[PDB]
Amino acid sequence: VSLDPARTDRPYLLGRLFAVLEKAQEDAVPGANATIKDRYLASASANPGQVFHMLLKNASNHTAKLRKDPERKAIHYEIMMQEIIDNISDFPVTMSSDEQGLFMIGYYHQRKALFTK
Amino acid sequence: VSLDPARTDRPYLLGRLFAVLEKAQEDAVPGANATIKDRYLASASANPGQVFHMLLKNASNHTAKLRKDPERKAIHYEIMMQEIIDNISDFPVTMSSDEQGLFMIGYYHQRKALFTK
Amino acid sequence: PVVPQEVSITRMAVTTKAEAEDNRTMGRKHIVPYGLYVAHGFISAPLAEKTGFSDEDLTLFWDALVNMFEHDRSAARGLMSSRKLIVFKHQNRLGNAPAHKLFDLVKVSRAEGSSGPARSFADYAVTVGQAPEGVEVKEML
RNA sequence: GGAUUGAAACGCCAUGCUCAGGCUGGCGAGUGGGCGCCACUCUCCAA
């Protein structure tokens, strides 16, 4: 078992999206004292509709800063973000417990891939 | 017989994960009067889908302290968690008796390895 | 299959000279969220001819079977009740068919809305077949 | 093509572990605790 790029289960996709967002921030601001997951992990899993929009908004700044210098992947990150958010229909207001567990599973599956190769 | 890192039986993997989480907590807050083993061991083995989404939050909360020190002992736990979750697909809502026995066996197998040289 | 659940309990007092000194004790329980059961039975005429078992006794027996659980309420029992009763009556002093064939005429299975776990009698469907000519089947009980 | 104290030699017929008995009665996860302290979108470009 590993990351499945065709599951299409909404919590799974949300977990993947969160993983990529945190990776982006990490690249943008090295050595940060307080990261996004330290700030929002509980709420993001419990009530996606509350926070995700502003998390997406801030992401643009991190990508914009990166692509301003001769370093790239940033296009790769935004490509992942766009292709993932293409499949999501809408952010739920609330989620059940098993759905929250699926969220974490998706998050970890996604995160392991990024450090491969 | 000893820890088999290729068994891939879901209760076995859950048992291993519980032990690693307990180890992380112990490292984070020395000398705690109460530990997750006392608070949750009964519940998790019976209904995994209800509590793991909570345990994983405190997992990150604990790792945050360590990673913020010059104590570098602290991505080892994250690496282990990535390995273990890589084989899981979903959390069972309920488990049978023999499955719980296998869960305990996996837990004890995992715990012994952590204390080797 | 059934899936028992185990629940934890507390108490305010102690029974004997324990030097804990407030909360004082803890307990345990086991319960079944839901389940449905089936039972079989037989009656023999030659033996009744020896003991004298008579018809009015049979009527009383039917009544007791119907109203068995009404007086059995208890702390641990929960709620239990009966739902169905089918009787096969042979037409002579010795049967006209094997029992196992008769027991097969009754079938139980999930209703259309299975919806995973069963939690009420409405989740099942019960049906009865057609009995051989030598046997009478009455089910209104 | 006389004589291994030898040459021959059944343990055999057949019989029910049966009749029946409640794991019960019952017990509070309960008492209570500020996400706070504070910080310029700002410097200049004919129609």
Round to whole Å and give the CA distance between B63 and B68: 9
Q: What is the resolution of this structure in A?
A: 2.9
Task: Extract the tokens encoding A41.
Answer: 């992990």
What gap in Å lies between CA A25 and CA A59, rounded to an integer?
7
Cβ neighbors of B66 (< 8 A, separation 6 or more) are B27, B28, B73, B74
Contacts of B64 in chain A (CB under 8 A): 38
Count CA atoms within 13 Å of residue A97 on its CB side.
Answer: 13
Please tell me the distance from the alpha carbon of residue B87 to that of residue B79, in angstroms, as a whole number. 14
Q: Is B46 on the interface with C (CB under 8 A)?
A: yes
Half-sphere exposure at residue B58, Cβ-oriented, CA atoms within 13 angstroms: 18
Number of other residues whose CB lies within 10 A of the CB of residue B35: 13
Q: How far is CA A107 from CA A18, B69, B81, C50, C57, in A?
A: 7, 25, 12, 77, 70
Breaks (C–N over 2.5 Å) after residues, chain C: 21
D27 C1' closest Cα residue: C11
Method: cryo-EM
Cα–Cα distance between B88 and B90 in angstroms, integer?
Answer: 6
Residue C132: HSE in the Cβ half-sphere, 13 Å Cα cutoff: 14
B53 neighbourhood in chain A, CB within 8 Å: 45, 97, 100-101, 103-104
Chain C residues 12 to 41 whose Cβ lies within 7 Å of strand D are 12, 22-23, 25, 27-29
Q: Do B89 and A1 form a contact (C-beta atoms < 8 A)?
A: yes
Dihedral angle sign, alpha carbons of residues B65, B67, B69, B73: positive
